[PDB]
Amino acid sequence: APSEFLDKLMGKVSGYDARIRPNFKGPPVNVTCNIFINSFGSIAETTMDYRVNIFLRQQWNDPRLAYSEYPDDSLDLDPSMLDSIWKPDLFFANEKGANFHEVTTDNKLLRISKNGNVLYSIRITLVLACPMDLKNFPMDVQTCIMQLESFGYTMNDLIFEWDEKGAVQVADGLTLPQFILKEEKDLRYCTKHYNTGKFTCIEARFHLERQMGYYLIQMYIPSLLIVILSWVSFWINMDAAPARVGLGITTVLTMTTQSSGSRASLPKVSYVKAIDIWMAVCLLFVFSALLEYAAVNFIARKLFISRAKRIDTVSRVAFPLVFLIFNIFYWITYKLV
Amino acid sequence: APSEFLDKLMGKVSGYDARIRPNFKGPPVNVTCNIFINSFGSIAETTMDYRVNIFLRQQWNDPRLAYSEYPDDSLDLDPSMLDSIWKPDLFFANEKGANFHEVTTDNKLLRISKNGNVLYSIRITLVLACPMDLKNFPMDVQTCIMQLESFGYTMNDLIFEWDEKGAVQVADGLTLPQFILKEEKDLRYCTKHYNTGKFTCIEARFHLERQMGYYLIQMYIPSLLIVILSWVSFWINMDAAPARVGLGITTVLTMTTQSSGSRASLPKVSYVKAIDIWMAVCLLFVFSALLEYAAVNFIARKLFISRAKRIDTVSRVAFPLVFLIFNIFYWITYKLV
Amino acid sequence: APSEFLDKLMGKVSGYDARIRPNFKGPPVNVTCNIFINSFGSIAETTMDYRVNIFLRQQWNDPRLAYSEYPDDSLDLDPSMLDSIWKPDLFFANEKGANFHEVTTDNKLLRISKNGNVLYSIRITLVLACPMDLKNFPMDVQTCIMQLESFGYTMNDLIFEWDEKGAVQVADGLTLPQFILKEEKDLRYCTKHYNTGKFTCIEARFHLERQMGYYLIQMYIPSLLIVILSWVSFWINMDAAPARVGLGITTVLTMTTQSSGSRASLPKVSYVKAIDIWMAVCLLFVFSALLEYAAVNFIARKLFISRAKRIDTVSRVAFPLVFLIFNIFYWITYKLV
Amino acid sequence: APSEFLDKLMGKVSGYDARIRPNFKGPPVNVTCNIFINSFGSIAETTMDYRVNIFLRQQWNDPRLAYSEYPDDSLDLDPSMLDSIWKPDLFFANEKGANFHEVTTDNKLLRISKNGNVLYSIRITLVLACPMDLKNFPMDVQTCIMQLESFGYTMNDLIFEWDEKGAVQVADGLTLPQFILKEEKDLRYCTKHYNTGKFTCIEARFHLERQMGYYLIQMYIPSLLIVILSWVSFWINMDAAPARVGLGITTVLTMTTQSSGSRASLPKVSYVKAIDIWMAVCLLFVFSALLEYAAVNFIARKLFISRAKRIDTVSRVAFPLVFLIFNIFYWITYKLV
Amino acid sequence: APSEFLDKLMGKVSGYDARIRPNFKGPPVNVTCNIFINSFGSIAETTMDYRVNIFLRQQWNDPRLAYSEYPDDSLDLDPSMLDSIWKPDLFFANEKGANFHEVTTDNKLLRISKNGNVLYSIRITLVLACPMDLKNFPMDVQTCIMQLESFGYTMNDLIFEWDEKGAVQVADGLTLPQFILKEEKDLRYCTKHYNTGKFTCIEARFHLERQMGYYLIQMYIPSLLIVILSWVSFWINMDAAPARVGLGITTVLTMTTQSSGSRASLPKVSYVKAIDIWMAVCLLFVFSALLEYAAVNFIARKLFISRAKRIDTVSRVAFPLVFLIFNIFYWITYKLV
Numbered sequence A, B, C, D, E: 001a002p003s004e005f006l007d008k009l010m011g012k013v014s015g016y017d018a019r020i021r022p023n024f025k026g027p028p029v030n031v032t033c034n035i036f037i038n039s040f041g042s043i044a045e046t047t048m049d050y051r052v053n054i055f056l057r058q059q060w061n062d063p064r065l066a067y068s069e070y071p072d073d074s075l076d077l078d079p080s081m082l083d084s085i086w087k088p089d090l091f092f093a094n095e096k097g098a099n100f101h102e103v104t105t106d107n108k109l110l111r112i113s114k115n116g117n118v119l120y121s122i123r124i125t126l127v128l129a130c131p132m133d134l135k136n137f138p139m140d141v142q143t144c145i146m147q148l149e150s151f152g153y154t155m156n157d158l159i160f161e162w163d164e165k166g167a168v169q170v171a172d173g174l175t176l177p178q179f180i181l182k183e184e185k186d187l188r189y190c191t192k193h194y195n196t197g198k199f200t201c202i203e204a205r206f207h208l209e210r211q212m213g214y215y216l217i218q219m220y221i222p223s224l225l226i227v228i229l230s231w232v233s234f235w236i237n238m239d240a241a242p243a244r245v246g247l248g249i250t251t252v253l254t255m256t257t258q259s260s261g262s263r264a265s266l267p268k269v270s271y272v273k274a275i276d277i278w279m280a281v282c283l284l285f286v287f288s289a290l291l292e293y294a295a296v297n298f299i300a301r302k303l304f305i306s307r308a309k310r311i312d313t314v315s316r317v318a319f320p321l322v323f324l325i326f327n328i329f330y331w332i333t334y335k336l337v
């Protein structure tokens, strides 16, 4: 019974057009649409994108196609009969690629309300492209934009607008592997201005903060500690080279293999990033040990001895102070601010 | 003969609706469904998901469409004629993507029993998304949820419920590469509460225990052993630096390259994980050797000698005791408890 | 001419059923099927599977559909008209996923013989899942099962059986990258017993022997050689530490970086595997050098000297003998036996 | 109303041919086409290609099919009715593979203007193959060609030509991970000459400059610094070997592990590339230290001492001067020029 | 006009069979086919295959379907009407998988000449499987076979044969990343002999020479140089161990980390390959240094001194001579010959 009464409305009986939008040659069609996101994942420095599947929930009413006569409330049509009725034409502007889910039954759901309101929900997996600045890598804060624009309909034809309450809803417990998702989700309108006209889009923004913990423990601390070891090598006797020169050289080598391993494990990028800066500077002080101490060892070979001891006290004071001033600038620079 | 008698029931002859569920404007439809899983694989820290193909076995009876007249028992229809009859609309809630198998013949099998019972079995490969906490990596225990929910039908429309005997059945000898599958499989109901209503889902839970063996042998033991070597470096003569300072520096370098290699082979994660904690702490004691011994070497340059020997005995007692207390806390912390 | 005479047989003219098998309500249908495999590849520890494309050759005769009237011998129908005639419903039980080849023309070939014999050959690429035990990795022998089962037809309905001569035929010169394929191919029947009944399957088994050569040369020999170097470090003077202690420490460090590199290049597995055992044990003796020699160095600081020399001779005898007994157990354990 | 009036024009009513182009047996059809590119990504040394999705905007007018009678301006037909009208047949010549986006609604948009002008815009993701010469890797400048050619229509049949204003338009803020996109985009005609005839193509060229920063900091500076350390090892006493020979040997080892790590992180290529040249040469000087110093150490064992000191001064002058001349040649060679 | 006149020929009007080949019950059909290859890429040791897209150009004439009446020369039919006419059934024998390009318009082009000649060109991307012997890796020469065979038609039914002039044509400037393509392309017939009969195939062969440059510079030279360093360690004083034993031990360690890094970067193979042989042998001499020098150091502890000096001169002469004889055998062995 509801099938045939549906066939009268959406079929060649009477009349209707899948081609023609509601209110043709009239006021512009509103689509109030809200999304419920199932998952984030695979956020890669490489392809410069993340992958997400959402439940896209669109609502719009056409004056046409509303019975008000028939006993049942709302209505439901089969995913195959989905073509018969006009749907708002929507793409995401920034995805590389997307797909429906056909698993088991088809995931396209549609309901036509008594009053003529239409609820159209589809489940879509899609890969969106987000621009990423790793300029500060460990202290990094990434912003993720998901923007939904109409395709081939100007402001005059239709408008996209968010739901008042719970427009974009994150399914809880996503626990993304490399990032934490900031609870605050900032959504706002966007407008496309082209030669052909003005087109709607709605832009959603998710703030993803990179958690630096693993990098703090695996990368920073060992290197810093090695630097302390070189500082202790500055304390070494004003006579013996091979254990002292040794301390410095060992310091250099350990620093180098550390930087090598970290350079293997980090994301591949050709622009200078924060962690790389830090590794490099640490390596620089590690060298500076053997620089000042080779200066001491060469000047050693009365006045020269006093200059060597003054260079020794000067080293002892300067290394921790310089590295402290440097830390003070660095951390405050990249973290917040 | 069974084809045409099938065409009477499922065809436009008499009447039937693929659109309309059984018992429309009536009592809610039960689907008793049980799954037989063929394989687990590719459980990745990266995409935060695993891949599995199952035989999904659904059973429900419609009062309509039951002959009882025809000589043959049950019936079978071709996978192409599958559309004619109503099927319960089901997705998995947590998969990123899924597909049917069309290989050789189509894998959708359907039988319509004499009494009007319907057995619908399909073979589906699908990638399900499981949240993973590697917070304790080596001692890790992962939980895997597979949840089957109806799409577009409220509690009033239909109910999903497990089989009484052997609801979820693991095909034996899966032997997952990185994990062991706990024989206990815990399944239970779940209920979706949304603005539109209450929807059914059935939730299956597989416990996967990570086996820590390879990490115990390749990562822990060498590092620990190196620590013992530094302990032996504490025994070294109270005079000679370069072999002793040498022992310490070598200890540091070996520790660092070990941590580097392990940092390459482990799964990539930006939050601090157990194995990383352990590596780091070991590296810390490795340093502490050269710290205490540089304290000794500097204080060495009557009372100072006694303080050096007391620092030597204190080192000999403290290092094994501190590392023992630490192990005692650590292992009990992450393993079970 | 053969097209229309084909249309009489397989068409609505006269009668036939794609739905209904041959000999319905009668004796069970034999399908004699043999496969010719084109390629093996991508055998991964990771996904626990290999990829193979085969020519699947099925033969069965239906009493129906046999002309015997028409002049031409056999017959051929277009891949699109393939649906008209009944085909035996077959899946592979263990694949994750599979596909036809549509490249250029369609690869489904079918011939209907004069006597009523049917030859149906299709080209299929598919990814089969094989359980792998790397418990012994270098000396490893893998077994690969390809099993073909009927889908939705009990023993009463049909039977699968191999060809008498050349049932499974390997296309020569496959030269798999990491494995060698044992010429002996062992195929045998298998029977599925389920609540619904008994179903046929034919199981093919390929023995793949892993060739250990690259691991013998790149991993074992250097490590073993390093162990010999430590043995030579046992010969070192009973006086001087830094070159001797040095020899030992260097031995340890080289061993560690070797184990690290090998730990990067090997397949990722969380259960203890043979090569890992071996690496670890070697590292253990490498340590044992510095253990016994630190015992000597500490006991050195009349009777103590004699105990040191006795520990020296004891070391010289024990290390090669212990490592020899160990090799004797190990190699015989994992290789064959 | 516009649907049926569209059906008169593009339908069997009156006449039209999807098969037959405009102006058949007449003047050649112009297609003015401009592209707006959404994203670049995944530019891999490996597959020798990049991935891009564009909005392809084609414009051509057919004398046929232009109403001029009907009140509405332009027109729009559904993506399914797209086949009815003739479209210019276009491939990209260099892609490995490509696809449409079907997500939500179909992304093919078409408008038929009153005058008979046709605007056809489609959204296409496609993977284009660009030849890459890494002969100079760090200082590298890559050129990316996107070429659009007609398929099966000679110069006599149709012509492709760019838009006058804003033919190829980059969507701002692409921020490709490993490269920077030069704002200058050079597009020009190309002509295919084959045995069958002459075919049109339009060729677009994007200049991508590789930014060498990360390689300057992570690879060059540490190595160079190590070289300086060996220079300082030339200053070492004319007597003592083990700290000096030590300095050299340590220099060699650090250099080697640096080259190893960099050899892991760089793109895999079997032809000699710039960064590799540089690493190798640095390693060569690092050796040259121990070469000249072993010459000194051997000649040391009156005149021989003077030759050793002269070799010492000669080393001190030559190493920085040779390495400076080398840098002067190298950097100017690969960067610009 | 040409559309309908095409419909007479290829349509049910008059008669024609897509099923039935030209000259049925007659002389065998020739297809002269030549390919123009667009790209090579992704040649992987792993999957044992390469990926290529070609323009496949087939030509054959059917006596049927030739008008000779109609004014226009040749003809063109739409890719959708491609089914109406018979096409030669062709697969590539060795591909794992393949696909058409549907991007923008369909890439299948067909022309039916006045005389009844048929030109059928299609653009196909496909992944072909080539057997690879890395037995000699750096000096490697790979051969790539592309073989095109008819599917389901015996020698009696049809024949495949190359074009006389320019049968296989490489699009210039392919510049494959790891290989160079030898300009000489050797194509020849191949014949399939099976139980069912004899089938045609045409086999094309591309010679790909691996360029060893990057391996010569990054792998060989550093190792060899290290060996020279050990040779220089043979010159070291007949008294002092720790710098000399040191030189040897350092030599060993650097060699080991070099072999480790190279073992990470090379393609993964379980059979012994040339570069591995070389690395191993070099490591062997590196050891042999400490072997002979430990022999000297132990025999040192009148006649014994003379034996030590004779072992010293013997070492100095033997190492370069043995390594030279070895190089002489090795390089000539793997390169050419």
Ligand SMILES: O=C1C[C@@H]2OCC=C3CN4CC[C@]56c7ccccc7N1[C@H]5[C@H]2[C@H]3C[C@H]46
Pocket (backbone or CB within 6 Å): A150, A151, A152, A153, A192, A194, A196, A199, D036, D055, D057, D109, D111, D119, D121
């Ligand atoms: O003519 C154009 C080209 C232009 O390309 C950049 C991206 C676009 C996305 N939407 C949908 C198609 C478009 C549009 C709508 C109606 C007529 C012509 C037309 N377009 C594209 C246009 C923009 C904006 C708009």
Ligand SMILES: O=C1C[C@@H]2OCC=C3CN4CC[C@]56c7ccccc7N1[C@H]5[C@H]2[C@H]3C[C@H]46
Pocket (backbone or CB within 6 Å): A036, A055, A057, A109, A111, A119, A121, B150, B151, B152, B153, B192, B194, B196, B199
């Ligand atoms: O209006 C909605 C949106 C909402 O999105 C979050 C996830 C959902 C999954 N199932 C199937 C679709 C839905 C539903 C059923 C019937 C009418 C409307 C409707 N939906 C979604 C809804 C939930 C729950 C339910």
Ligand SMILES: O=C1C[C@@H]2OCC=C3CN4CC[C@]56c7ccccc7N1[C@H]5[C@H]2[C@H]3C[C@H]46
Pocket (backbone or CB within 6 Å): B036, B055, B057, B109, B111, B119, B121, C150, C151, C152, C153, C192, C194, C196, C199
């Ligand atoms: O009811 C079932 C479920 C069960 O699932 C595990 C795997 C199976 C594979 N084949 C094809 C489908 C099945 C079968 C045939 C006819 C009626 C019911 C039915 N099945 C599955 C069954 C097994 C065995 C058999």
Ligand SMILES: O=C1C[C@@H]2OCC=C3CN4CC[C@]56c7ccccc7N1[C@H]5[C@H]2[C@H]3C[C@H]46
Pocket (backbone or CB within 6 Å): D150, D151, D152, D153, D192, D194, D196, D199, E036, E055, E057, E109, E111, E119, E121
């Ligand atoms: O006969 C051919 C083969 C040749 O192959 C190399 C690449 C080609 C791409 N376009 C489209 C097909 C082609 C063409 C057009 C009309 C008749 C025959 C024909 N072709 C190919 C040709 C070229 C150029 C042109």
Ligand SMILES: O=C1C[C@@H]2OCC=C3CN4CC[C@]56c7ccccc7N1[C@H]5[C@H]2[C@H]3C[C@H]46
Pocket (backbone or CB within 6 Å): C036, C055, C057, C109, C111, C119, C121, E150, E151, E152, E153, E192, E194, E196, E199
């Ligand atoms: O009966 C067979 C099996 C056999 O399998 C190995 C590979 C083959 C490829 N081509 C196309 C199909 C085949 C063929 C043609 C006509 C009748 C039967 C038939 N086949 C396969 C055959 C070979 C050779 C040939």
